[PDB]
Amino acid sequence: AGVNMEVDESQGGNITVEVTSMGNADHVVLGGSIDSDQTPYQGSSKNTGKLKLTV
Amino acid sequence: VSPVIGVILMVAITVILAAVIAAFVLDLGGSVGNEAQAGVNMEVDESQGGNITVEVTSMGNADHVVLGGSIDSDQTPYQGSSKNTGKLKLTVGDSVTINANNDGSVANYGLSSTEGTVTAIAVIEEDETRTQVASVDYSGFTAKDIS
Amino acid sequence: VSPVIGVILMVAITVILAAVIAAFVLDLGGSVGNEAQ
Amino acid sequence: VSPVIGVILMVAITVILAAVIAAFVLDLGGSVGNEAQ
Amino acid sequence: VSPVIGVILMVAITVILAAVIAAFVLDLGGSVGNEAQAGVNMEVDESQGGNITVEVTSMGNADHVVLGGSIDSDQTPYQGSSKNTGKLKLTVGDSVTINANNDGSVANYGLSSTEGTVTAIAVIEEDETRTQVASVDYSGFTAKDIS
Amino acid sequence: VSPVIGVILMVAITVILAAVIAAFVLDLGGSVGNEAQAGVNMEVDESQGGNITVEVTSMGNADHVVLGGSIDSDQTPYQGSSKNTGKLKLTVGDSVTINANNDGSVANYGLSSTEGTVTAIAVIEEDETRTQVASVDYSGFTAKDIS
Amino acid sequence: AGVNMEVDESQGGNITVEVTSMGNADHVVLGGSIDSDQTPYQGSSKNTGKLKLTV
Amino acid sequence: VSPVIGVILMVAITVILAAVIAAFVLDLGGSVGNEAQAGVNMEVDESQGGNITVEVTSMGNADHVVLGGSIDSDQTPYQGSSKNTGKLKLTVGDSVTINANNDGSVANYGLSSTEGTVTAIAVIEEDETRTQVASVDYSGFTAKDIS
């Protein structure tokens, strides 16, 4: 999959994740430092860090 | 005698296993597919509440362009070629304008959030390939009774 | 056999990477703006 | 028989190595940045 | 019987050898690294003994720029942001001037040879990658008590 | 009875032979090694007897760059970072100039032949891998008392 | 398995281990110079060098 | 005893079969060949009945360029370096002009059809490799007594 992740460093900072191509995958999930207990800052999600990202 | 018969049997096993492996590898060789290409122009007008205008300049190899991201696809976009709903099928020469302001009984003209990202997705219907070709960030908009 | 399958996989990688690069360069092509006079 | 199993195993190695290379090249494709004007 | 057992043993050998080869090739796949990029401006003033001024306009992907070549890093450079020593850490907006003339008890202001090349090297500290981004040749300088 | 005992003995032979073959093939699987990579810049100045300047822009995976070919490694090169002898250890940012002219009692400044090839060799000390990364041809030089 | 190990040489140095593919393995464990008595520097672990790494 | 003798005989069979397979695979390894490369310039002049001019700018690895397609190789082409017949051997610097008009007793100057395709083919005589390097479509020509 082609996933685009970029860091905004201004005023406390934000991380925006976008998917450009699915390749052969079904969905993209986030891992690492994710506190999946909490809802992410706006975006398509509005549910929780247990994302199912698609193009 | 034993070893010759063993050779025979192992050759049979080799034939069957080769058939299986051929099937697997030939399946794996046909799976590479297209990625959609299109030239989509998205621009933000920041004056007086703000508007977003999406235009397509080239189809590349895609069939149509659909919008994603912050789109409130429940509502009709602000004029443009659309006059139907955010479930657009954009093609070269089509112009659609999105607007966060509302109008009387009608809710927002396609934008629910006052800030966010709008993404343009190129679609190939033969494969169901969906590829993101453009995106633009908007902020500082407003949601009021007229535009 | 191995090298043919490797070719296939690298072509897939090429498609994905080309999509990413196309997105970047098309973003960069729309940014030139006006100066007021 | 040995060579067919070897082919299978080398195809598996190819898949893993292709994944690694895809990760590297996709990281390298997102790094180009702006210069201020 | 013998050939079947031989097949078994050769399959075991294949597994072990495949593990070894996988290890080697996966090591070889992670080694490609960065080359440093920076826009360094070096210019020579030829009047009255001559001076060399180094300025950095863009960091690219580097962390800092260090000087090499004919640098006498034992001595402090002629004014500029440095005022410490030829062991510079140049960043965007830093100006350092080098000078072959000396001053009283102080030896040359960074240039030992009257002619030679000064090179600018971009450094990435994560990898210790060092790449030459610019160089300039100087000649006809002088080494006297003042500049 | 005879054939069963023969089967047993041939299985033993198979075990020993498989051990030998495993040893051979595992030795053969560890031998693939590195080739050195470096970006070396070599240029010829053709004016007034001529000079050759060698500069390194990138180390790639090598440890240092050594010169070969027409090098008279008996003699010190013409200025540059070297000031020791043609047995150089070049690294990024190092400049060395070679010159066919001589000076008083000193023989040529690194070039014995008036025409020939100078080659740059990248060295990896872990393996003793030596790989040629660049070469340049020079001709029409001169050998006189000064440069 | 496809395991990615890289060394950061700046300011005392750090080692970051990431797994990109599980292949056929269940988990990845570290060996060699590991002082498994002590907790590793941040990352997903926060427990001890007796890791069970996954993609 | 039987199984040991069977092992011996199967080893002999293995030697013979390995020889056969080696012969086959070594034959298959020498067959990959060249494709011809050349830079051929073909342009159509549409004024006053029309003419086609073919020029070669680079030989690449080919020996000569021959024309194909709509060529009436029975007739001499309109001036140019040729003055012999459509069985050209074009090389860098050669210009040949083709023309569908005829002249008195002479038939067309190389073009029989009023519309069609002319193709340029690069030839390597060592292998007899023939590769198409360029083609151009022409239409709206005429066939009359003069040009």
Side-chain angles (χ1 to χ4, degrees):
Chain A
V3 185
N4 191 22
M5 312 191 22
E6 70 143 30
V7 176
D8 184 17
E9 286 149 80
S10 67
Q11 60 185 357
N14 286 286
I15 308 180
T16 295
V17 187
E18 268 143 53
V19 187
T20 71
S21 182
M22 266 303 81
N24 64 0
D26 300 322
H27 58 260
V28 163
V29 281
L30 307 184
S33 309
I34 312 303
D35 185 9
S36 62
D37 311 348
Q38 300 307 134
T39 312
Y41 189 67
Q42 69 155 318
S44 310
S45 176
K46 290 289 192 176
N47 60 355
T48 288
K50 92 206 298 313
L51 278 314
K52 260 87 181 153
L53 300 182
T54 60
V55 168
Chain B
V1 80
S2 318
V4 184
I5 280 307
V7 167
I8 277 304
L9 297 178
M10 245 45 93
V11 172
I13 304 332
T14 301
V15 154
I16 295 163
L17 182 63
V20 170
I21 292 167
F24 174 76
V25 303
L26 292 175
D27 155 20
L28 185 57
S31 65
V32 176
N34 329 86
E35 283 298 8
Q37 297 171 355
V40 185
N41 191 22
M42 312 191 22
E43 70 143 30
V44 176
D45 184 17
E46 286 149 80
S47 67
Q48 60 185 357
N51 286 286
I52 308 180
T53 295
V54 187
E55 268 143 53
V56 187
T57 71
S58 182
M59 266 303 81
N61 64 0
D63 300 322
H64 58 260
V65 163
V66 281
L67 307 184
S70 309
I71 312 303
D72 185 9
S73 62
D74 311 348
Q75 300 307 134
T76 312
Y78 189 67
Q79 69 155 318
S81 310
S82 176
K83 290 289 192 176
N84 60 355
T85 288
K87 92 206 298 313
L88 278 314
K89 260 87 181 153
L90 300 182
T91 60
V92 168
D94 286 31
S95 307
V96 66
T97 303
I98 344 174
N99 172 6
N101 302 44
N102 65 46
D103 192 346
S105 59
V106 194
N108 44 228
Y109 285 113
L111 303 179
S112 178
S113 304
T114 295
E115 61 271 305
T117 304
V118 184
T119 67
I121 299 148
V123 183
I124 293 168
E125 319 215 71
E126 145 202 356
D127 288 297
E128 310 190 349
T129 279
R130 303 179 83 243
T131 312
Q132 178 171 303
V133 293
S135 64
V136 152
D137 292 28
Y138 73 92
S139 182
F141 283 12
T142 193
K144 289 199 325 312
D145 192 47
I146 208 154
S147 310
Chain C
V1 80
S2 318
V4 184
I5 280 307
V7 167
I8 277 304
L9 297 178
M10 245 45 93
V11 172
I13 304 332
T14 301
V15 154
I16 295 163
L17 182 63
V20 170
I21 292 167
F24 174 76
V25 303
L26 292 175
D27 155 20
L28 185 57
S31 65
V32 176
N34 329 86
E35 283 298 8
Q37 297 171 355
Chain D
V1 80
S2 318
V4 184
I5 280 307
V7 167
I8 277 304
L9 297 178
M10 245 45 93
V11 172
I13 304 332
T14 301
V15 154
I16 295 163
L17 182 63
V20 170
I21 292 167
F24 174 76
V25 303
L26 292 175
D27 155 20
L28 185 57
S31 65
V32 176
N34 329 86
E35 283 298 8
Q37 297 171 355
Chain E
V1 80
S2 318
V4 184
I5 280 307
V7 167
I8 277 304
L9 297 178
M10 245 45 93
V11 172
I13 304 332
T14 301
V15 154
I16 295 163
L17 182 63
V20 170
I21 292 167
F24 174 76
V25 303
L26 292 175
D27 155 20
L28 185 57
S31 65
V32 176
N34 329 86
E35 283 298 8
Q37 297 171 355
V40 185
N41 191 22
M42 312 191 22
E43 70 143 30
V44 176
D45 184 17
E46 286 149 80
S47 67
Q48 60 185 357
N51 286 286
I52 308 180
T53 295
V54 187
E55 268 143 53
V56 187
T57 71
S58 182
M59 266 303 81
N61 64 0
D63 300 322
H64 58 260
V65 163
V66 281
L67 307 184
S70 309
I71 312 303
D72 185 9
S73 62
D74 311 348
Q75 300 307 134
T76 312
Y78 189 67
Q79 69 155 318
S81 310
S82 176
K83 290 289 192 176
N84 60 355
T85 288
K87 92 206 298 313
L88 278 314
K89 260 87 181 153
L90 300 182
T91 60
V92 168
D94 286 31
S95 307
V96 66
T97 303
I98 344 174
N99 172 6
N101 302 44
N102 65 46
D103 192 346
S105 59
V106 194
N108 44 228
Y109 285 112
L111 303 179
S112 178
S113 304
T114 295
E115 61 271 305
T117 304
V118 184
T119 67
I121 299 148
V123 183
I124 293 168
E125 319 215 71
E126 145 202 356
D127 288 297
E128 310 190 349
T129 279
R130 303 179 83 243
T131 312
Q132 178 171 303
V133 293
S135 64
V136 152
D137 292 28
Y138 73 92
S139 182
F141 283 12
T142 193
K144 289 199 325 312
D145 192 47
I146 208 154
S147 310
Chain F
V1 80
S2 318
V4 184
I5 280 307
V7 167
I8 277 304
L9 297 178
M10 245 45 93
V11 172
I13 304 332
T14 301
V15 154
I16 295 163
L17 182 63
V20 170
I21 292 167
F24 174 76
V25 303
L26 292 175
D27 155 20
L28 185 57
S31 65
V32 176
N34 329 86
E35 283 298 8
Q37 297 171 355
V40 185
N41 191 22
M42 312 191 22
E43 70 143 30
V44 176
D45 184 17
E46 286 149 80
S47 67
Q48 60 185 357
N51 286 286
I52 308 180
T53 295
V54 187
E55 268 143 53
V56 187
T57 71
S58 182
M59 266 303 81
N61 64 0
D63 300 322
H64 58 260
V65 163
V66 281
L67 307 184
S70 309
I71 312 303
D72 185 9
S73 62
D74 311 348
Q75 300 307 134
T76 312
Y78 189 67
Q79 69 155 318
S81 310
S82 176
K83 290 289 192 176
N84 60 355
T85 288
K87 92 206 298 313
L88 278 314
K89 260 87 181 153
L90 300 182
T91 60
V92 168
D94 286 31
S95 307
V96 66
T97 303
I98 344 174
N99 172 6
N101 302 44
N102 65 46
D103 192 346
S105 59
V106 194
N108 44 228
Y109 285 112
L111 303 179
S112 178
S113 304
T114 295
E115 61 271 305
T117 304
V118 184
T119 67
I121 299 148
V123 183
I124 293 168
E125 319 215 71
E126 145 202 356
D127 288 297
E128 310 190 349
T129 279
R130 303 179 83 243
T131 312
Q132 178 171 303
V133 293
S135 64
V136 152
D137 292 28
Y138 73 92
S139 182
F141 283 12
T142 193
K144 289 199 325 312
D145 192 47
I146 208 154
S147 310
Chain G
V3 185
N4 191 22
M5 312 191 22
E6 70 143 30
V7 176
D8 184 17
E9 286 149 80
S10 67
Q11 60 185 357
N14 286 286
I15 308 180
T16 295
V17 187
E18 268 143 53
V19 187
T20 71
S21 182
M22 266 303 81
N24 64 0
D26 300 322
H27 58 260
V28 163
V29 281
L30 307 184
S33 309
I34 312 303
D35 185 9
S36 62
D37 311 348
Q38 300 307 134
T39 312
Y41 189 67
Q42 69 155 318
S44 310
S45 176
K46 290 289 192 176
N47 60 355
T48 288
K50 92 206 298 313
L51 278 314
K52 260 87 181 153
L53 300 182
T54 60
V55 168
Chain H
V1 80
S2 318
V4 184
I5 280 307
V7 167
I8 277 304
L9 297 178
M10 245 45 93
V11 172
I13 304 332
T14 301
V15 154
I16 295 163
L17 182 63
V20 170
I21 292 167
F24 174 76
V25 303
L26 292 175
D27 155 20
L28 185 57
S31 65
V32 176
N34 329 86
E35 283 298 8
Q37 297 171 355
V40 185
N41 191 22
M42 312 191 22
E43 70 143 30
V44 176
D45 184 17
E46 286 149 80
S47 67
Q48 60 185 357
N51 286 286
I52 308 180
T53 295
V54 187
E55 268 143 53
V56 187
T57 71
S58 182
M59 266 303 81
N61 64 0
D63 300 322
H64 58 260
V65 163
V66 281
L67 307 184
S70 309
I71 312 303
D72 185 9
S73 62
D74 311 348
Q75 300 307 134
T76 312
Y78 189 67
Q79 69 155 318
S81 310
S82 176
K83 290 289 192 176
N84 60 355
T85 288
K87 92 206 298 313
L88 278 314
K89 260 87 181 153
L90 300 182
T91 60
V92 168
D94 286 31
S95 307
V96 66
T97 303
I98 344 174
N99 172 6
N101 302 44
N102 65 46
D103 192 346
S105 59
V106 194
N108 44 228
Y109 285 113
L111 303 179
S112 178
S113 304
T114 295
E115 61 271 305
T117 304
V118 184
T119 67
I121 299 148
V123 183
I124 293 168
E125 319 215 71
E126 145 202 356
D127 288 297
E128 310 190 349
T129 279
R130 303 179 83 243
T131 312
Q132 178 171 303
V133 293
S135 64
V136 152
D137 292 28
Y138 73 92
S139 182
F141 283 12
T142 193
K144 289 199 325 312
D145 192 47
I146 208 154
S147 310

